[PDB]
Symmetry: C5
Subunit: 310 residues, 5 copies
Amino acid sequence: PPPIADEPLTVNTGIYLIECYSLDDKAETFKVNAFLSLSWKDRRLAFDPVRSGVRVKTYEPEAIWIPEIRFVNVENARDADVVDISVSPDGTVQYLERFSARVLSPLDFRRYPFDSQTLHIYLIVRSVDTRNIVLAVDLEKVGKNDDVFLTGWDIESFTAVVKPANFALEDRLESKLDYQLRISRQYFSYIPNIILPMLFILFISWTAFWSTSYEANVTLVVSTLIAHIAFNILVETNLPKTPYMTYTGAIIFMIYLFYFVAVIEVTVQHYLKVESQPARAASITRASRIAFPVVFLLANIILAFLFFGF
Amino acid sequence: PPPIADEPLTVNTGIYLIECYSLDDKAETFKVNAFLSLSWKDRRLAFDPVRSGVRVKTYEPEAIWIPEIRFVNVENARDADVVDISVSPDGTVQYLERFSARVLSPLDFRRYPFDSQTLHIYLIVRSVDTRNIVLAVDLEKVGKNDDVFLTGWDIESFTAVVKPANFALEDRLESKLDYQLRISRQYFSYIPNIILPMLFILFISWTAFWSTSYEANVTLVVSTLIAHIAFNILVETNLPKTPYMTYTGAIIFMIYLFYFVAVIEVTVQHYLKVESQPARAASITRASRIAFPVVFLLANIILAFLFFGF
Amino acid sequence: PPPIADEPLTVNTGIYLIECYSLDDKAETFKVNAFLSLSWKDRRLAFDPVRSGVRVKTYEPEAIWIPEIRFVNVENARDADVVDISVSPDGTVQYLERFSARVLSPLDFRRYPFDSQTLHIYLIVRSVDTRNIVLAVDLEKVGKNDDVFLTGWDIESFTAVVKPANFALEDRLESKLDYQLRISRQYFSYIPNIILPMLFILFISWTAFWSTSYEANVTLVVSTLIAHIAFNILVETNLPKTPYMTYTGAIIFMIYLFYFVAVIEVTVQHYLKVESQPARAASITRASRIAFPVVFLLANIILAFLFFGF
Amino acid sequence: PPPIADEPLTVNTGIYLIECYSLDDKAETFKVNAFLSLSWKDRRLAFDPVRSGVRVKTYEPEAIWIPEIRFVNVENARDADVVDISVSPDGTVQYLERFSARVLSPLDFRRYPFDSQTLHIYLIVRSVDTRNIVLAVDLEKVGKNDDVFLTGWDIESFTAVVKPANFALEDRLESKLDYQLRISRQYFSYIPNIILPMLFILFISWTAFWSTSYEANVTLVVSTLIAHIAFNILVETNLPKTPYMTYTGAIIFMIYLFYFVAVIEVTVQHYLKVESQPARAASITRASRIAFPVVFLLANIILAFLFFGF
Amino acid sequence: PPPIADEPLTVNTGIYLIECYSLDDKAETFKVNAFLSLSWKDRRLAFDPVRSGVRVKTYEPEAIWIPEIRFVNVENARDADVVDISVSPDGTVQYLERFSARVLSPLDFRRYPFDSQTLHIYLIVRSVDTRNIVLAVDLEKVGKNDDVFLTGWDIESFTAVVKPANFALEDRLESKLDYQLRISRQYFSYIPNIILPMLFILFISWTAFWSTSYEANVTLVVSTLIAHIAFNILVETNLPKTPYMTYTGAIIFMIYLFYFVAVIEVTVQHYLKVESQPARAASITRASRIAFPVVFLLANIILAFLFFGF
Ligand SMILES: [Br-]
């Protein structure tokens, strides 16, 4: 039973994040629990303060006409309990729910361990005969308690794009708003647990430049290449199948090379020292002791710069 | 209370995918959230535009008779909230829900990392006294926003088989429609993380052709064979028990061989170099240095062609 | 308000499997989605075809008395939506639901990779004053679409035991029916991924019979014994704690032996070749080269025969 | 509307287990599906057999006053459908439901692989003005069909503590009953899959007593110590964090020692055979060949006795 | 229909934990099942004891006005069944539910294996025209049965902050209470299964100080470094991505070093014993045999003190 207007009735929205949690890098989703604040003029139930009752009159959902405000990017129907409805005398309605749905926003894993994000929440509203434009009321949008969690992410800002986007969707215009949650990752536990350990094995790898034994040079360069897979696999696991290249997927894959040429050297420093020409052997071996850490440190500056500095 | 017809009443369907996500290769399911658009002539509630009210009249579900449109391949009862019902004067009803159910469509892992798919959504409708044929209205089927996700899959097209399939199921004909979601995989992260690393270990494996030590040739060929299982197992895990053979299950199993004969060689290059006949040893060893990468590259062309080129 | 009979009222049942999925070997359960067809004479609402209305009269569940048909082996209350109720003039009722519950049927893992199964679904019905016998109507039991899935299982037949079992359960007889789903496993992906790889490691294990080095004979027989645990563990995982012995649990455990005596040999071929008696060493080592694959192939024929051939 | 009594009204209870399953050693819970049989004198609806109707009168739940019988140790609200209600003439009510809730009973993992258990189900009932004592009717308690499952557990007995425990809980006495499900584990699959394999690796470990090579003695004792972790980890996983010590956690940890002193020996039989004193070496090595299996078999009798024999 | 007051109506709260379980260190949540005790003066339904009925009058929820008491940190809408409502004559209401929701409280993993915690449960209550202050009634707060579980945690105390926190949230003050569950971990199973085994491997690592062979010194220090990752990975898994440093993440990462310089030494004791200067070699090697365990034991006292002693 919608409110007879003279023009496109505006519905005023707001979101107060109460809880944030379980951001799931694999599925690219996150769970939010927040307030939903709606409001509109329904002159139809304006009501004579003096003449009866009091300042503001409390209704149940069934009485009033209420606008269907559906979330756009969501696994299932949102999950709200209603908190209070209060009609002002000028026929102005004040709605407040407290929903909790899991939200499907995509992430950009281009800088993986060192990445910043921009989560989205949507809310469309389809029209009937009287058009619906949604818009934001920025006093009920200051939504994000000084308690918002989000394990392993620093929360930067919850803002929103004032100007809605009015679509034409199946012979009925809808109106869609963009609520933005800006977060940066807590890269760090990525160092003691991935980055450093991954590097340490890589150095030990090429300790076999100061060695002459093949037996202990493969028991060396090879035994470390395995450990790398343990890390490649550990990392490849808490991360989705990007159609593009990650930063750690880069330096994790650049690494695979410095083991391949590493093994090449030890190998050559053999069909080169069984061909009685150790003239060359401990000449090559002597060089790798520099070429490597330098090509590396060079390629990491090349690689690093390639991703962040551009 | 169904609409007295003169012949099989047609119900006109449509689906606008709002969200796609969590395609689960193991369980062979995916979750979809979309619009469901139904419509039919129920002359029974035609209504004199001029004589009363307005252009179109809004009903609640309970009032009108509405057709039971059940999804065929679905874990549980679909999960829909109703969005609007609008009856035209000629007794024409306009229905719109916004459901979200998880869908059971099978996948063909024959080309695993490099595979394309054809997801299905069904919709039957069982009859009573007046028959039900369903059919598609292609203005409400253009369903798939320029935002449809599906992590790690490129979406190609959402179309549908106009001609329904009318069954006879337990003394009552049902009518089933075929909605098709065509997707190709984002093979790629499959390279830096599986294909390449898997290959690198295989090469190092057979570095033991340029070596004479048994101690360092098993510490060699064997230490890599393990790494392979770490990959076989990693891969075998994010994949169901196909009764047929995968492509990577092929080349992952073709590989097991090139380690077995690899180990055979190093082994023979021993009970052949302890039998003072290194005449033969560094003759065989010398050969393997070619036989292998060639039998391989040959067998991969043989293998690859076998799967895609046919 | 139950139908005044003159004797034990018969209720006629049937099930049309629409979907089968997620058979869970660990929990010994499976999920089914099907039609449930019930029917009985309730002379009490017979109704004069000519005198009023039409051929058959449609009721809601609340109107008619309907028999509580509870599933016996089920995690939770079954999960049904009602599809149609149609009363015939002779007072004969036609019921049809479309439930989906997860079913607790046990499995016999005696032949694990090569095992066939017999799933059960139950349906009791407790009496009040007029007794209830259930029984099957085999036109609504032909239930299993040419689409029934069940990943990694070949479905053989869905039949049912016509004669119910009438219990006395707490001073009220119930009537229970036995619906049988017969399935065989898709053993196969068990070969390229378990059986073969498991065998290959076992062979390499005992390549150390054609070797003299202890260093490379333990680096040998031992490095494979580990791989076996990787498989024992992989297999032990997708299988419950049987109080009996599996077939692959057998040959997986028979295997552990052929590594133990394998290691015994290499060990003895040492405190026997450091005791300057290589007379004996390369005599024993020479023999194992046959004793083993033969005791094995013999014991697998002994073992295999023991399970299937009896 | 509770039944005006002259003293504490007794409610008579009973449970017929229909299904048992998914006993979860980690969470310490199990799922049960059973009958719940209640009964009490509500003289208030006694009813003149001859004067009207019949022998017993069938009511719906809403009519009669029924006692709130809540389960004490349960994840969520129990999950019951009602099966039948029958009031006797003397005002005696006969209730019967068929619930299925998951039950939180603790387990004693002190003897882990060889442990017996005592599951609990509770049922309180809070009073109003007339007190409620619950008590058991042992004809509706013979609950446990000759079909009760419980994968990997032998079921011994379902009995119950006739005498309830009347609490005072928040100015209202409740009455709690103790239903006991006694089960022993099916230890066995624990042998071919854990116990034996775990032992075999331990023996091979100390084959390095009949060896002189350090290279092959570490490639020996060490390569097995890993295998052990694979088992320690496999076992530690299907088991909760006991604040006490398991039996297999014991013998799994006693084992870690026999690898440590095992490695100590091989190590010493080296900075003792490079100090040209093989006088001592193959004297110590010679001894370990006994000290070990004996200290072990001794410590296992010491250990085993310590747990079961006391 | 809220109770006309003369000032901010106080609502008196309380919680009786019946069950605690599944504390999930990764997600930082826990599941609780407890009583919720509310109470307030609604003079509006005071009721003449003598004049009619009895001492206290039982209502259903729909009759009385009841305050919306929403939990603040919760995944979804809490999950409560109502247990009893009793209105006193002075218009005083007595409410009792029995909810079960999963609770989002954060944890401080700074001392991981040896950490104590402080779980929170919240309860706000938004106002309308008459303000709501909540407050605690400490006879219905003694909530935590002598049965409260919480696997692998010792429960210390369930108390609550008497003084609520009255917010202004969107032009309506809410009133929030703090219920505290204080728990310490059952560190222990962390020793036989993580701490000790992790240490053992570390010692064996540096047995290669009493050795001269490079071949068996890398087959040594390296083979253990892998085992460490198996533990680093095992531990890193049952723990979230802290933006700070764990204690075991410390000593697990301090360890990585003592393997790196460990490998450095064995490596140097080679390009130093192939340079015919074993003067120095078995001088350095001789020293490491002390420097290491001491730098360690020193650094663990340095490390340990750094975390707990401050
Ligand atoms: Br491993």
